[PDB]
Design a protein around this ligand. Structure first.
Ligand SMILES: [Mg+2]
Ligand SMILES: [Mg+2]
Ligand SMILES: [Mg+2]
Ligand SMILES: [Mg+2]
Ligand SMILES: [Mg+2]
Ligand SMILES: [Mg+2]
Ligand SMILES: [Mg+2]
Ligand SMILES: [Mg+2]
Ligand SMILES: [Mg+2]
Ligand SMILES: [Mg+2]
Ligand SMILES: [Mg+2]
Ligand SMILES: [Mg+2]
Ligand SMILES: [Mg+2]
Ligand SMILES: [Mg+2]
Ligand SMILES: [Mg+2]
Ligand SMILES: [Mg+2]
Ligand SMILES: [Mg+2]
Ligand SMILES: [Mg+2]
Ligand SMILES: [Mg+2]
Ligand SMILES: [Mg+2]
Ligand SMILES: [Mg+2]
Ligand SMILES: [Mg+2]
Ligand SMILES: [Mg+2]
Lengths: 89, 96, 57, 53, 168, 107
RNA sequence: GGGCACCACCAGGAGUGGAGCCUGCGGCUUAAUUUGACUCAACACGGGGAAACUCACCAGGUCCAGACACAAUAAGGAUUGACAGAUUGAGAGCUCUUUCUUGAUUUUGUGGGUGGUGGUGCAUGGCCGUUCUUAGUUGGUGGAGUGAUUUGUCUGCUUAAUUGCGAUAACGAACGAGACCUUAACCUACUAAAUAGUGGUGCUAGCAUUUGCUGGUUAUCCACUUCUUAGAGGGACUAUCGGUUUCAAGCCGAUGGAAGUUUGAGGCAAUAACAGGUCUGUGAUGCCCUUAGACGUUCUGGGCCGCACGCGCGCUACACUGACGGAGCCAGCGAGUCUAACCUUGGCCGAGAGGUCUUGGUAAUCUUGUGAAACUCCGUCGUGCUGGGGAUAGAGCAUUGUAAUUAUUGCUCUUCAACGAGGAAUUCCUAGUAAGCGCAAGUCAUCAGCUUGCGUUGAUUACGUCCCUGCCCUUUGUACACACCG
């Protein structure tokens, strides 16, 4: 029972004449439909990351007073040290 | 890292007497520029030097800039039995 | 897989000093390492001059 | 050693690579640049190529 | 060298780009701000603008002979054909690359984002600038990323005056 | 050597027209105060090296293209000039960003 | 309710949807047919034109390129290879027999690294797309409100524009628009040029004549810059004059002008966002997975091209406003090799594709006046699926390549298919524009039916409106705020 490339010419069901008799499956005219972006505003992860996770990771809104009142002085110290190391001493 | 002692000494001698190495990241280049070993051998030996200290490494557009350090300039004298504390190699040797 | 070695002293070349006597034999090849190599069926195969090789065992 | 880079890559996509990142696809080799089109947009002001029109 | 002037000027631009990124990677702690390559006859001069020029020049020829040797070996120049000077940048708080590289090690040393960002925004602003803006984008122990801005003063965003006066 | 005119040509190439014209005016000023005979600064057509890359790193988006471009401005000056004092003034006075090349022509 | 826009319509143009191929997507098939992307904002997109490589996929085969540290170990011993002979792809010592060989470089465990086009782009950076090429955003002081807020930032008119006039509890400002920059258009005004051109002629020289058409030399000529080039400038500001508007911003016409559509075209382009795309651009990257019978890397061969079919971008067509042939004969943007064989003129050979001997060119120098195609003229055809169309298929000759079979592509002869202008629907477009036409560049060893640009020929139709679609603003309602996918 020889098969292979020589068995390809012997093998039935392969060929345009007998593929054209069989009907097209109906999935060929369908669509993938948007990779589940129909409710992308609705978060589907199931985390819904809480108030603490954003008020302690990037901080809350009320801690800006502690940040910039100390960020006033470090740049002034940088100016003082830059005048110290520029050409003085 | 099977690499002969004769080949290893020609990376270490060049690194001592000339200070730095540049090697393109192209393994099987079969010849490093101005080291007469394989480019894979150069990269492979200087990474082995880097891991125990002794060499700093930057990459920067596929070229592996290898620079000898202060612990490495002592290591290249001690284990390799090159003349002791008389040869800086090479940053202040001739040019200053 | 790669290589298994055997405990050895004498490589097919008996003894250079056997109670004051050289007891060497076994017609060699042109290797300066001479050294005595594989023979399957009337066919030696060289070890340093295995690239070009004229007369065998 | 035996067959490690035994295939000829004297030509084609795999002969050349970006000098920044070694990427065979999307490369520009106009004027001997050999930078990919994604790194050329980053470095294009350092090369000297400016958006004018 | 027998190449066309198109390819020669393009390749000199590529050499500038490669040298600039190499010094950006190498001289990060040393306050790098830019490089200028002067191609004189018989030698080329590579001038490094960096705030810590004493850290660039190292300890008595260390760290500047290293960079000269590294550049001449990668670009295959003859020894002595390339010399590599370092002159410090004046008015540090107007170099955007120096301010960004300063913020980078400020945040890598573990300093707060608003503190570092306002500490360079007002440093630029009283270094004598018309305006400054720091945008920080990313995440911090959080599964969601946000970008926050820190602006002070007068800025522009469109036109050739951006190529003129804005340093990014 | 004894003030024999040798017919050099200076080729001036740059991507920066301001500094290139600074060099060109310097050479013409030197050759006019030295009373040299010259064919002056001839300005070649500017080579506009255009690269139309794709603006996106992806495929996604409206298909937007960027025309990055580099201009090469090129000039040449012919100088029938003595050999020593003119090779001195072309050895000195080199601007960065402008590449010079000096070729002696006896054709 | 009012605005705006040929990603809307009107009036039209050119179409597409129908055919055949090309290409991309889905599905099916497969060992694999790698994968991301799905209304605009996926579908000639990932610069994605994949023979190998790329390559991520499949059947197999190597290699370690497993740092470093510790303990064993290798001094008990760790790499290499000549056969031939196989289950071999195989001249792969990959094993296995046989043996020798350079011998603390390794090897084997534990830790820990390193690699990954492996995952998560719903952890991120960066970049890009979109809202939006729209005109929007914000605070100082004052007014209103206990307050969140609101006015300013607006009824009208105008503009391309939160552009301005004007109304006015607001006044005066900033970003965005605009100004800016690049390009195109004018400059017989300036500085010039054997890498551009012209005129005489130092000198020539030819054919026809009574000077027309040319050829050739720049310490083996002179002069000039009109044309060409590129520096610095000039120029336009809707100028002038009418009309009209509240004599306001403006708009319309005419004259002049190189230019009166923001002069044409772009580049840059705010605040706020999107769970938009990308971890498969990177030595951008957290974490996870894998890490030597690997998901690293390499090699061999295949696949990405597989086809009952559905859809999108295109090419070629249905011809006489044309095909064929001969002749005429004209661009512009480019690019190009000694850091090695790139652009190739000329001669010769060849029907052709191509070959071969040389040459110029690292380029305003030479390819190149890219002697391009459409087009024009004269002929053959003659309304016939024809001499339209050129699919499919056969045989042959070449080129590139290590390799062309699943035809790489080119050429010659032959085969000569649907297609007779395309239902429902749908795209783009307002003047050097639509459209026809080729050329250059990109990727490229070879391959353009693609794209980015360039020029050649060059219309019809409106200078408008909210009717459809989308967007913006105001008013209104709200039990929405994860915001109607509520
Ligand atoms: Mg503005
Ligand atoms: Mg603007
Ligand atoms: Mg219509
Ligand atoms: Mg058509
Ligand atoms: Mg069709
Ligand atoms: Mg497929
Ligand atoms: Mg995905
Ligand atoms: Mg892989
Ligand atoms: Mg990676
Ligand atoms: Mg108020
Ligand atoms: Mg308001
Ligand atoms: Mg208003
Ligand atoms: Mg009011
Ligand atoms: Mg002129
Ligand atoms: Mg998503
Ligand atoms: Mg890709
Ligand atoms: Mg393969
Ligand atoms: Mg494909
Ligand atoms: Mg014809
Ligand atoms: Mg022309
Ligand atoms: Mg192909
Ligand atoms: Mg092409
Ligand atoms: Mg394509």
């Amino acid at each position: 029972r020889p098969s292979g490339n020589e068995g390809a010419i012997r093998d039935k069901t392969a060929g345009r004449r007998n593929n054209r008799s069989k009907d097209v499956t109906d999935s060929a005219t369908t669509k993938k439909s948007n990779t589940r972006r129909a409710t992308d505003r609705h978060s589907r992860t199931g985390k819904t990351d809480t108030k603490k996770k954003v008020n302690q990771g990037w901080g809350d809104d009320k801690k800006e007073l502690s940040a910039e009142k100390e960020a006033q002085a470090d740049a002034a110290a940088e100016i003082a040290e830059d005048a110290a190391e520029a050409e003085d001493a | 890292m099977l690499m002969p002692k004769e080949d290893r000494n020609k990376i270490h001698q060049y690194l001592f007497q000339e200070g730095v190495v540049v090697a393109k990241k192209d393994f099987n280049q079969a010849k490093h520029e101005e080291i007469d070993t394989k480019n894979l051998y150069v990269i492979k030996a200087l990474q082995s030097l880097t891991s125990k200290g002794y060499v700093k490494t930057q990459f920067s557009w596929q070229y592996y800039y290898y620079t000898l350090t202060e612990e490495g300039v002592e290591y290249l004298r001690e284990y390799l039995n090159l003349p002791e504390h008389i040869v800086p190699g090479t940053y202040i040797q001739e040019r200053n | 897989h790669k290589h298994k070695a055997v405990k050895l002293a004498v490589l097919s070349y008996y003894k250079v000093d056997a109670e004051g006597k050289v007891t060497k034999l076994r017609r060699e090849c042109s290797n300066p390492t001479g050294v005595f190599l594989a023979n399957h069926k009337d066919r030696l195969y060289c070890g340093k001059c295995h690239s070009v090789y004229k007369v065998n065992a | 050693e035996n067959v490690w880079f035994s295939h000829p890559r004297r030509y084609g996509k795999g002969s050349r690579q970006c000098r920044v990142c070694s990427s065979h696809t999307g490369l520009i080799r106009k004027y001997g640049l050999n930078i990919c089109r994604q790194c050329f947009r980053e470095k294009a002001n350092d090369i000297g190529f400016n958006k004018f029109r | 060298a027998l190449i066309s002037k198109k390819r020669k000027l393009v390749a000199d631009g590529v050499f500038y780009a490669e040298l600039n990124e190499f010094f950006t990677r190498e001289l990060a702690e040393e306050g790098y701000s830019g490089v200028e390559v002067r191609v004189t006859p018989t030698k080329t001069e590579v001038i490094i603008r960096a705030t810590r020029t004493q850290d660039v020049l190292g300890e008595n020829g260390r760290r500047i002979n290293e960079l000269t040797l590294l550049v001449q070996k990668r670009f295959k120049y003859a020894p002595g054909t390339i010399v590599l000077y370092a002159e410090r940048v004046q008015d540090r708080g107007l170099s955007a690359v120096a301010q960004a590289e300063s913020m980078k090690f400020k945040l890598l040393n573990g300093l707060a984002i608003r503190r570092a960002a306002y500490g360079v925004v007002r440093y630029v602003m009283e270094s004598g600038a018309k305006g400054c803006e720091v945008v920080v984008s990313g995440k911090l122990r959080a599964a969601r990323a946000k970008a926050m801005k820190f602006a002070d003063g007068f800025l522009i965003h469109s036109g050739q005056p951006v190529n003129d006066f804005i340093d990014t | 050597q004894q003030q024999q005119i040798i017919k050099i040509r200076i080729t001036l190439t740059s991507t920066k027209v301001k500094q290139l014209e600074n060099v060109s005016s310097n050479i013409v000023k030197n050759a006019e105060q030295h009373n040299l005979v010259k064919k002056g600064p001839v300005r070649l057509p500017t080579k506009v090296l255009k690269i139309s890359t794709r603006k996106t790193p992806n495929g996604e988006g409206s298909k937007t293209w960027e025309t990055y471009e580099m201009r090469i401005h090129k000039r040449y000056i012919d100088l029938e000039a003595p050999v020593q004092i003119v090779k001195r003034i072309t050895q000195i006075t080199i601007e960065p960003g402008v590449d010079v090349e000096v070729v002696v022509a006896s054709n």
